[PDB]
Subunit: 320 residues, 3 copies
Amino acid sequence: TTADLILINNWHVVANVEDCKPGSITTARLLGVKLVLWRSQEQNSPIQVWQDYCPHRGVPLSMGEVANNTLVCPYHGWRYNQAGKCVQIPAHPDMVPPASAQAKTYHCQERYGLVWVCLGNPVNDIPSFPEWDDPNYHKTYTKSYLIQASPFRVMDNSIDVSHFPFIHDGWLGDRNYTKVEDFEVKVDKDGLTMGKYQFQTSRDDSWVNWFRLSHPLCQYCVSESPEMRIVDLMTIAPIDEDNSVLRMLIMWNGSEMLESKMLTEYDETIEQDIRILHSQQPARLPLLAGLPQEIHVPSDRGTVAYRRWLKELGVTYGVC
Amino acid sequence: MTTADLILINNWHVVANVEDCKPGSITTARLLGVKLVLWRSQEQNSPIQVWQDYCPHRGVPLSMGEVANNTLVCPYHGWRYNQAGKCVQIPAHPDMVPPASAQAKTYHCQERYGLVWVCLGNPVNDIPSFPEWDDPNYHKTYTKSYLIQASPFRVMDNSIDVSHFPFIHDGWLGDRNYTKVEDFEVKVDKDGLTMGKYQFQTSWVNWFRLSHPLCQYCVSESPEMRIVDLMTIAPIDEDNSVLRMLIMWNGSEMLESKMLTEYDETIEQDIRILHSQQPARLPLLAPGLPQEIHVPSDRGTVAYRRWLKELGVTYGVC
Amino acid sequence: TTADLILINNWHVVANVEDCKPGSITTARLLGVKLVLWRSQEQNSPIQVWQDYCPHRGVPLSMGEVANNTLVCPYHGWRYNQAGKCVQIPAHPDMVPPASAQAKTYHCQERYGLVWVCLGNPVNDIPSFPEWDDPNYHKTYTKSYLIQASPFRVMDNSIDVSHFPFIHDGWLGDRNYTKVEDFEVKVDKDGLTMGKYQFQTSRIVSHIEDDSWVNWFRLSHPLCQYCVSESPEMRIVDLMTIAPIDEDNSVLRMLIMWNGSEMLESKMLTEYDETIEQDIRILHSQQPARLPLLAPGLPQEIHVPSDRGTVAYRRWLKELGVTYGVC
Ligand SMILES: N=C1N[C@H]2[C@H](COC(N)=O)NC(=N)N3CCC[C@]23N1
Ligand SMILES: N=C1N[C@H]2[C@H](COC(N)=O)NC(=N)N3CCC[C@]23N1
Ligand SMILES: N=C1N[C@H]2[C@H](COC(N)=O)NC(=N)N3CCC[C@]23N1
Ligand code: FES
Ligand code: FES
Ligand code: FES
Ligand SMILES: [Fe+3]
Ligand SMILES: [Fe+3]
Ligand SMILES: [Fe+3]
């Protein structure tokens, strides 16, 4: 559709690299734009990410097929090379295709095993994830979670910490320890950082957490106990103003065998969050100024800072 | 889909049956485009709270929470709201007095006739009268609720209409062999709309009164017994209704199953018409479809449309 | 609904006559209008096509019943004769029904075994289909295909010929024969005509070696197409009609005739069913849903020479004043 510039000119994850096999075609949606992702059959071939649209008669290129190093539209068979240019119009095999005959292409980077996409001019870097190449850390990926909520509501819920003893009771919080101790929040040029805060729970029931968003739809979260360190990179694909795809990449320095339990814990807490997110009204995130206005208490300082940050960045897409 | 019409916002509407609201329970309803939460504490004889179904902290429906002692507890961060709607406890700051704004939006509620009546505005008018409720000679019964995809004013218009009886109610309220409708009287004044006595030839004498444009008090009488009912139409929005009937009669109590079946048969015969009617809003008088036609036997539905215009109704009409 | 007079003042197929038995009641939708089709029980009774609406309290007359030569509303039993005039108000059997007690009636004509309807004042005539009266030709009707696309996109796809060797590979074309030979197109007093166009394919309805086919078509009406497909061994003609339900939905029907053995009917229906469904898969996917007209978000349409017919179609639609379901 017509997102804002801080969104258009930023990188977003739209798929896992394992979803794009050689020779394959897959689809995604980002900020209202339909995307086609494709690869040739060659070893280690790159991923192309284009608007899913043939400009001849408006057919989705994702309904075609990969032939050699080209994507072929199914309707009249126009072939597009890896750079998106039409190289052949079969009805007129000796005709030079017109210059307008070209797919709209976008920037694509593989990083952390994820497929990152920028629909505009990539002025920002992909958020950093320092544990990625650390040999002491194993990795696992959650499945994708399609969520019927504004992406900025999804992230709001991920910055919120006082909800742990309620919807995450027995997982991330304790019904009997509801008080939220003071913590610090800074918004500056590194984005939003929420400082260390302790919360009592087993998954050894003492975990210190902090997290940083250099990017309003990506969160780097660190949770450390004396026994082990777990970090994750949470990415929210903003499908449109009202729908999101959540993905989490998780790394931990404990035993490799803990993987199956890691995914079960995340799956349980994510679905606990999704139940709330689908229920929230209005579905779009209200900024700081029918339905009453939002109320803020001191433990909301992080989510208040998020709303202030979004207003400062000029976000108008998926908010109110 | 909400209204400012005073005769609607400043009036009482049935949203539920009291049997559906047990102690410690949480139920939901919609009225005039507003989502409601109904809840009671676990105490015997506890009152029924009727609030907008909405936590002002982060906008979660309160109806997804639980009842704890005398409070409704939001599931997201556990804020606790007392029976008066005031937040009494915010668990992340156990010693803090909640902000004054930490309050549920509460509505007037009154139990009457075994029904839960709600006023979203300023309760000017009283709940409709139902004289037989106090008469120990009359048994009572409640139909199930009927959700109807039609304007509430179309639903009431169909309930004031009498000439359709020999057609869609053939064999139940009329007879296809006696289709002529005899003369009858209708009055609209300070007490609302009153339809005088009428009767249909078959092979029962009736009258009814509306003081409230979405409630109807019906009287039907035979030599054998007398039946009265209070039909209420909850206006969910401009295009959807919930119809309920409270039926009272002074014959044998054992007639209950048959009466419920007869009502069910004729109500469903009406719903088949109501769901099909075009346009869905009720057309008022003298305003790509032609204007309605009125014949003498439509005098009651004509008077109903005149009454709604005098009352200034704009919601659910056209 | 549309003010476009070329649509309102034209004829459109809404049913097959075989779908309208004596005494029957059926429904259809046309240009946003809900229709009721009904016939008396008498043999050879005419077909009435009315707005599906009782002017008393707004009930669909299609929910009623046919009694003698009247259609009876189910709600209060008012009876409407074949001309749409209410002749009986059962609540007041002696009253003179008011002049307003009258169904909205539309012009209806049966032609080629199809039910044609005009919602307005018919300027144009029903398109002509010369082989209808030729006794050398056998006929068959496809079933009706409901398509979630603009009627003008559906017709665009039927005027298109370069797509045959791709989505009709193995049926109307050959992935080894993708070049589209030159052909002519005219927009004039006859409407839109595509001149003879030869293409390479063997077909299920003819001999293995009979693989050089020649197509031709004419539209005098923007949503009906008369197509002729001819080889040295056989000649096949069809009348395709597209009923514009609304701006975004259409019903396609095809009446097929051929100068050959009546035994070929099953293979004829198989070929048309296979190819129509291949077209529908594309039609459902195209964006935007309305047909973009010519004009020197989404990029603009690109045109190459083999698009000369679909370009002429878009030009013709602007000359005719079409605004419904386009752009
Ligand atoms: N499902 C979730 N589990 C939690 C873990 C805690 O962090 C770590 N690194 O274990 N990760 C994470 N990103 N957050 C943000 C909100 C709470 C949570 N969401
Ligand atoms: N289904 C319906 N049964 C009838 C009964 C009247 O019968 C009694 N016994 O009061 N109740 C009622 N509200 N009305 C209004 C019109 C006809 C009717 N609708
Ligand atoms: N599904 C379709 N089958 C075809 C038949 C004859 O076509 C051929 N090529 O024999 N009839 C017809 N009107 N048309 C227009 C487009 C192609 C076609 N659509
Ligand atoms: S629509 Fe893609 S080649 Fe024609
Ligand atoms: S949303 Fe209700 S307590 Fe936070
Ligand atoms: S609505 Fe058709 S007869 Fe009354
Ligand atoms: Fe959570
Ligand atoms: Fe009725
Ligand atoms: Fe085709």
